[PDB]
Amino acid sequence: TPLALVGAKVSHIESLDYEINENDLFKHDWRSRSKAQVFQYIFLKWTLACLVGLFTGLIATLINLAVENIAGYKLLAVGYYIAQDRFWTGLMVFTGANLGLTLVATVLVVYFAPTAAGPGIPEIKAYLNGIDTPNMFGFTTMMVKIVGSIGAVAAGLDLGKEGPLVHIGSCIASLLGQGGPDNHRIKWRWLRYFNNDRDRRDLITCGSASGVCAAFRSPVGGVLFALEEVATWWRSALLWRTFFSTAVVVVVLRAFIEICNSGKCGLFGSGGLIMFDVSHVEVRYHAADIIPVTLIGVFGGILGSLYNHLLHKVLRLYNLINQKGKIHKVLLSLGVSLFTSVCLFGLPFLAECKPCKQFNCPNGYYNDLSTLLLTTNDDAVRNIFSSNTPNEFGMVSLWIFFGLYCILGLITFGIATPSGLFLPIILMGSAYGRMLGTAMGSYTNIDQGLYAVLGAASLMAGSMRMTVSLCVIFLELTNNLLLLPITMFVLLIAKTVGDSFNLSIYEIILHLKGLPFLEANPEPWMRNLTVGELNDAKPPVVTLNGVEKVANIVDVLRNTTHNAFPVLDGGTELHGLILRAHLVKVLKKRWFLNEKRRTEEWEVREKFTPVELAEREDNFDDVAITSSEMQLYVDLHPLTNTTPYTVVQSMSVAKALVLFRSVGLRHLLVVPKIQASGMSPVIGILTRQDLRAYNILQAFPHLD
Amino acid sequence: TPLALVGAKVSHIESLDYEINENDLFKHDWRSRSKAQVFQYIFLKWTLACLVGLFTGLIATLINLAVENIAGYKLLAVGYYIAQDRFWTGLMVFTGANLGLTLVATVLVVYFAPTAAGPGIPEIKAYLNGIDTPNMFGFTTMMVKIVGSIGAVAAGLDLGKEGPLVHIGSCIASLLGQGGPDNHRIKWRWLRYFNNDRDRRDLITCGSASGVCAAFRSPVGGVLFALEEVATWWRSALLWRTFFSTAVVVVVLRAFIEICNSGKCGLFGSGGLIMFDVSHVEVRYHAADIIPVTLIGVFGGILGSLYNHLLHKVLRLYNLINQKGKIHKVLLSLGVSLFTSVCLFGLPFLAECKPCKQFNCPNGYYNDLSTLLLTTNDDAVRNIFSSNTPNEFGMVSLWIFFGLYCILGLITFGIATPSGLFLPIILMGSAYGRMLGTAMGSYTNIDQGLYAVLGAASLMAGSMRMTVSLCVIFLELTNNLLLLPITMFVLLIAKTVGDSFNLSIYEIILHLKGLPFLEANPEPWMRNLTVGELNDAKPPVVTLNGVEKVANIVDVLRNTTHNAFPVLDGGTELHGLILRAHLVKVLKKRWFLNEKRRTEEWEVREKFTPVELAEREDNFDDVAITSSEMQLYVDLHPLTNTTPYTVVQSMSVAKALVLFRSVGLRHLLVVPKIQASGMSPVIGILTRQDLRAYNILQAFPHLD
Numbered sequence A, B: 001t002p003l004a005l006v007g008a009k010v011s012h013i014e015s016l017d018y019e020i021n022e023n024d025l026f027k028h029d030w031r032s033r034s035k036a037q038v039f040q041y042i043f044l045k046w047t048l049a050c051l052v053g054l055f056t057g058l059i060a061t062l063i064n065l066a067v068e069n070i071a072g073y074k075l076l077a078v079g080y081y082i083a084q085d086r087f088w089t090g091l092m093v094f095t096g097a098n099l100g101l102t103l104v105a106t107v108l109v110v111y112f113a114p115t116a117a118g119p120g121i122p123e124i125k126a127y128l129n130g131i132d133t134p135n136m137f138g139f140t141t142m143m144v145k146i147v148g149s150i151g152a153v154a155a156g157l158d159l160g161k162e163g164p165l166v167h168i169g170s171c172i173a174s175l176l177g178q179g180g181p182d183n184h185r186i187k188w189r190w191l192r193y194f195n196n197d198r199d200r201r202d203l204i205t206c207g208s209a210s211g212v213c214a215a216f217r218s219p220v221g222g223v224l225f226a227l228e229e230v231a232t233w234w235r236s237a238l239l240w241r242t243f244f245s246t247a248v249v250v251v252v253l254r255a256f257i258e259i260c261n262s263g264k265c266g267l268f269g270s271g272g273l274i275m276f277d278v279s280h281v282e283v284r285y286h287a288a289d290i291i292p293v294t295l296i297g298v299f300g301g302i303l304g305s306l307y308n309h310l311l312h313k314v315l316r317l318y319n320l321i322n323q324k325g326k327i328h329k330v331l332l333s334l335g336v337s338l339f340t341s342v343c344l345f346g347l348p349f350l351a352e353c354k355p356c357k358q359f360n361c362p363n364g365y366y367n368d369l370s371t372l373l374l375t376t377n378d379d380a381v382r383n384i385f386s387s388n389t390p391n392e393f394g395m396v397s398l399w400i401f402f403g404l405y406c407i408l409g410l411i412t413f414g415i416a417t418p419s420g421l422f423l424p425i426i427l428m429g430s431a432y433g434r435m436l437g438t439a440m441g442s443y444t445n446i447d448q449g450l451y452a453v454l455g456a457a458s459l460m461a462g463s464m465r466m467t468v469s470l471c472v473i474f475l476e477l478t479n480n481l482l483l484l485p486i487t488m489f490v491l492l493i494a495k496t497v498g499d500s501f502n503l504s505i506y507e508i509i510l511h512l513k514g515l516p517f518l519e520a521n522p523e524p525w526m527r528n529l530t531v532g533e534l535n536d537a538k539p540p541v542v543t544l545n546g547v548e549k550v551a552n553i554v555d556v557l558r559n560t561t562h563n564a565f566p567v568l569d570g571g572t573e574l575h576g577l578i579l580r581a582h583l584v585k586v587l588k589k590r591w592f593l594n595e596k597r598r599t600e601e602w603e604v605r606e607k608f609t610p611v612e613l614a615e616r617e618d619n620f621d622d623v624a625i626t627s628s629e630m631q632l633y634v635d636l637h638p639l640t641n642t643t644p645y646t647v648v649q650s651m652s653v654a655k656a657l658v659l660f661r662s663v664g665l666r667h668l669l670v671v672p673k674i675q676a677s678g679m680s681p682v683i684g685i686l687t688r689q690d691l692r693a694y695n696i697l698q699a700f701p702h703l704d
């Protein structure tokens, strides 16, 4: 089924073309170019990687600067009325401003760019696997994701800018490889080297890693994020261009931190999670700390699996509300923001007052819950992470904080709004961490702010099951490399306890959206099934001849939806594989022949250049062919990929899947091993759909 | 040619078996085991990864503790005679002790374990590529590498323990997967899961990464070292076991630093390069520092390429001296240690005395050259790296230090001794760094110890061309994550200038040794040559039948050196591929048949278990078959790999090499695309030798 979910939009799903056509007409290998053209490609490779890091760091500062200025002046308006002891007018100002900011973010998503809803990371993970996710990296998708995240984080919703920044950096990288938006591209001739799926995969890998770095000021952990979780294929040359892009981001981030520390960015200059200045120094290896630190890792895998189980149920319910229309998506976002505003305002009435933010109880008494609930989310993280504050938060007020963001983490992820998953899990993980550090009390020497850092890392390993990128991200946030063995100890337990119950949250969202992700290892029942038994449960192969009539090319373009056709002669010779995108091009160019001649090498080079062969902005329904041209002939030999990858009929599905994913294929031919004369030289085409364990188990149900 | 160099030993070279036989008789997939046996394999996977990190960290402390105790008391004996103003007796004590320590290290190498010479990193890089390097991970190779490194670093030679520790950790991992030495293995039944080349590749990857971590106390940079440089194949599950092993190493290293800081390890307790306690704090971005920092990167690529050019010439000369016999290897090591001792002692006589180590000039005057030359190498690094010492070393004495270790770096690498390449390059790189920082003088605010750190990183990127692992190694040495953009700036220039002249030093050593390393990308002339043209320049394929006579099996075992044979019938059916190691097993078991029957499924399971099918300690010359058994029959069907990877005759050599390296193959069948009856179903076998650009360019010379 070529139908899946992209963002919040049901769409048509194809695959990407990573395979190289080795004909010199196409010029797919950059090593076959001139010596001057290689230096142009190398210089533009490293200029694009610098501009990706420069623009991701510049946009992340502007999102950081606008959110705390909108939410900073919004709390002054609510603070203006609570000083006059008017709590009922301060509630409506707080709820009304949060409803208007959520309305701006959610109307831009549903009515202008529905793929800008969510974090966008499970669709970049699908795109770098080879799945052509449409409307993902446009210019209007990026602008809605930027403005819809400023309106959502400043509205006090339980979400972060951490997730959307990974998609913004991937959108910047895709727009720089084309020369701008899709109908406003500059036609600079040097940009023709990047009009292929092999180079767009390299660009979006640097762009998604710059967004992880812009979210956490972590230039090493951003490269380890894309290497471990997001990207499928990797080499050491891509590893060094990616690491260059993330170091430009921390140059831009640290240069604008020095400016916004000198008070010239306003009175709300000093930003959020990247402005984290608490290093936990001289952690003391006391032997009685084995019991609480192991319980941090055990509770992170238990709560991380329970959060994955309940979010999988909430997102199934939200898919029913989303299919009721576009006005039902807007009411779901405003209903969450209404419930969030009355719970972030009404719940500090139930807290206790500790003796000397003053809220609802007179002077000499400050509210420990209004410190966390009535602030921004990135400032509430730094209060729980704070060191040398041994009993700043009571045990009762931390249970209310933990129980609220357990509820707000479930209902905010999935609304038609640019959402995130890092900051809801950090807020939920730091709450039970400092609860377990306060409950130990005097029987431990680990700081209670360090228990909150270890708790936020454990809930993220229990939910997302990434571990080596999470270690370096939490080491570059705290700026303490001596915290590695105690951080890696709780990521070990939380991933182990978490993997024993269910899958990661990114495998669940990829399964809910129906995106055909190809996993690295085959199932053990795939080794007992062969490729030739898989071709008997599917219709026969639609092939073309080497010199083909125009009416046969038009017939396979109207009556089928396949994108590759084997090229035969009709003993008979298998020439290779021609794509659908090249069959439309010869019908649009009208490179037609009178007789059944096979042309020469100079005939195709007058009609086609390597630039127009790489373009994909063609459509078959605009091509009008009369019956005078339906009897002519097209020579398909200069446009056929004459070296496709093949398997034999007795090859297993397990080893064909390993070949399909290691090389990065879209189509895999099946040739006969029977070796007889008068045989068809191709008996199957395998695609991504045929080699998925979800689809094989429905046409062969007796294998599980 | 199956002849190459392994360490300092000419040896026979085969490849490793990574491909899975999907017959259930072999049990190669661990997912097809019982649920109890999977938990035994998972527990023993993570126990072995903990024991690799525990034993690599324990051995690295003992090498650190023994070297500075031997060299510490040796300098007290030389210091005893220079206080009596007897410099001629202090010279003979210094030269005599250094000659005796070099003699112990070099006799153990030439006469007991000749593969323990050098760093061992270019042979682990070859082993993880699929090349079966013999005598590399034995128990007596590890013990010679441990003792031969204590005797060599304490003898004042220009080499480090950094390189040999990568080979020691790989030897620990290989011995733990077998249960001890090769003739002293414990027969614990749970260790049968690790008797394959897929699991030895995972073990040695963690062991080589623990050795990089034990050398630099860098648990992140050790994982990035194996990922970028050493290992060929990588997945995210191996990435998390490797990162667990390196964090056990820094637990053991930091626990024995706290003990050897309290004076209980002796008066020479505080060790070397892992005892580096100079963080360079508040680096100030002054705009006049663009000119000296760019010159640090430009000189690192120029001197790094010139060092690669001259070491390639010195190692060619040393191969002529090594082939003159075993006593010529011992004299080359003693001649280098004689030249090193008289230059580390005689050269501080030429230096100037700066006013108040006192050497050769009276009180009120200390020698700035005796501080660097007459100490250990790891203590001379910390003096140049030292901060807030603005003019401790004169310009004249630093030219003598730089010019000496340019000479000593060339002649010490290659002697029959466990050598290294990190510490000669760090000493050479920190010398010109502090020369360029002293020459700027007052016109810069970057510390001159930070110029030495940036110079040592630039010469290592100009020579070894690794960049992302070198960044994190130098960030975890200095313990300063804010030094990333200025460190990555000079690694960018030095790798760029270095790559414009020649190759890295590990590609040169791999080429000098003749090891058949398979590179990731094919050459552009490989796309114009097909696989079927490659099979016409080689002898025809030696095949066997499915039920084969014993005399035919003995004939291909005596008259050929091939390790796989296609299994046919003789229209005719291609069954698959049988290995040479399984043909020796049925001749040793004498599973012989009277008639030409094909056996059943229960007949082979009485003769062979999955444990004895995985063992490789068999030899054909001990197998004695009389002429009464030469007319019998062997059923080769239950031992044949029935799903091998195949290509067609019209596939190019470029795309066959990509399939060969992505999957990890040893043999690749070539099937006909001609599709005729009465044809042989196999027309070629491709191996690692056939797909090498060095070998294709000699049988097809008109392609370059």
Ligand SMILES: CCCCCCCC(=O)OC[C@H](COP(=O)(O)O[C@@H]1[C@H](O)[C@H](O)[C@@H](OP(=O)(O)O)[C@H](OP(=O)(O)O)[C@H]1O)OC(=O)CCCCCCC
Residues within 6 Å of the ligand: A042, A043, A045, A046, A235, A237, A241, B492, B493, B495, B496, B497, B499, B500, B519, B520, B521
């Ligand atoms: C301060 C800014 C510093 C940035 C500049 C830093 C530029 C820099 O660091 O790269 C150096 C450049 C290599 O560029 P780059 O690493 O991107 O190119 C890779 C390199 O060519 C590998 O050798 C290839 O692998 P292989 O051999 O086929 O196996 C790999 O092919 P593939 O794996 O992708 O298929 C290539 O991608 O080499 C030069 O000397 C060009 C001098 C012109 C440089 C002009 C740069 C403007």
Ligand SMILES: CCCCCCCC(=O)OC[C@H](COP(=O)(O)O[C@@H]1[C@H](O)[C@H](O)[C@@H](OP(=O)(O)O)[C@H](OP(=O)(O)O)[C@H]1O)OC(=O)CCCCCCC
Residues within 6 Å of the ligand: A492, A493, A495, A496, A497, A499, A500, A519, A520, A521, B042, B043, B045, B046, B235, B237, B241
């Ligand atoms: C403090 C010490 C902490 C160390 C313990 C930390 C142990 C730990 O962290 O791993 C958890 C373990 C996974 O073990 P591990 O990651 O090594 O195994 C990989 C995992 O199974 C992947 O799912 C596989 O990929 P895929 O699915 O096929 O695609 C991969 O196969 P392959 O790619 O290799 O072919 C496997 O290698 O999962 C459990 O719940 C077992 C509970 C028993 C654990 C008992 C451990 C003693």
Ligand SMILES: Nc1ncnc2c1ncn2[C@@H]1O[C@H](COP(=O)(O)OP(=O)(O)OP(=O)(O)O)[C@@H](O)[C@H]1O
Residues within 6 Å of the ligand: A002, A013, A014, A015, A016, A538, A539, A540, A541, A542, A543, A561, A562, A563, A564, A565, A566, A666, A685, A686, A687, A688, A689, A690
């Ligand atoms: N040329 C062809 N002739 C016959 N069947 C085909 C052909 N190409 C693909 N198929 C089969 O049709 C089914 C649907 O595939 P689809 O038409 O989506 O191919 P595709 O669009 O080329 O593949 P993808 O969607 O991965 O790009 C698949 O199971 C595939 O095996």
Ligand SMILES: Nc1ncnc2c1ncn2[C@@H]1O[C@H](COP(=O)(O)OP(=O)(O)OP(=O)(O)O)[C@@H](O)[C@H]1O
Residues within 6 Å of the ligand: B002, B013, B014, B015, B016, B538, B539, B540, B541, B542, B543, B561, B562, B563, B564, B565, B566, B666, B685, B686, B687, B688, B689, B690
């Ligand atoms: N069964 C076979 N029949 C004929 N030729 C073969 C066979 N196997 C390998 N060859 C060819 O013989 C040449 C030498 O190969 P060699 O005998 O070293 O194979 P091998 O030992 O199996 O391979 P490797 O050394 O990579 O393990 C190679 O070019 C290869 O293509």
Ligand SMILES: [Cl-]
Residues within 6 Å of the ligand: A007, A117, A118, A119, A120, A121, A122, A123
């Ligand atoms: Cl998403």
Ligand SMILES: [Cl-]
Residues within 6 Å of the ligand: A159, A160, A161, A162, A163, A164, A419, A420, A421, A422, A423, A424
């Ligand atoms: Cl987020």
Ligand SMILES: [Cl-]
Residues within 6 Å of the ligand: A119, A121, A163, A420, A421, A422
């Ligand atoms: Cl996410």
Ligand SMILES: [Cl-]
Residues within 6 Å of the ligand: B007, B117, B118, B119, B120, B121, B122, B123
């Ligand atoms: Cl070596």
Ligand SMILES: [Cl-]
Residues within 6 Å of the ligand: B159, B160, B161, B162, B163, B164, B419, B420, B421, B422, B423, B424
């Ligand atoms: Cl070394």
Ligand SMILES: [Cl-]
Residues within 6 Å of the ligand: B119, B121, B163, B420, B421, B422
């Ligand atoms: Cl080395």
Ligand SMILES: [Mg+2]
Residues within 6 Å of the ligand: A002, A013, A014, A015, A561, A562
């Ligand atoms: Mg399709």
Ligand SMILES: [Mg+2]
Residues within 6 Å of the ligand: B002, B013, B014, B015, B561, B562, B563
């Ligand atoms: Mg061989």
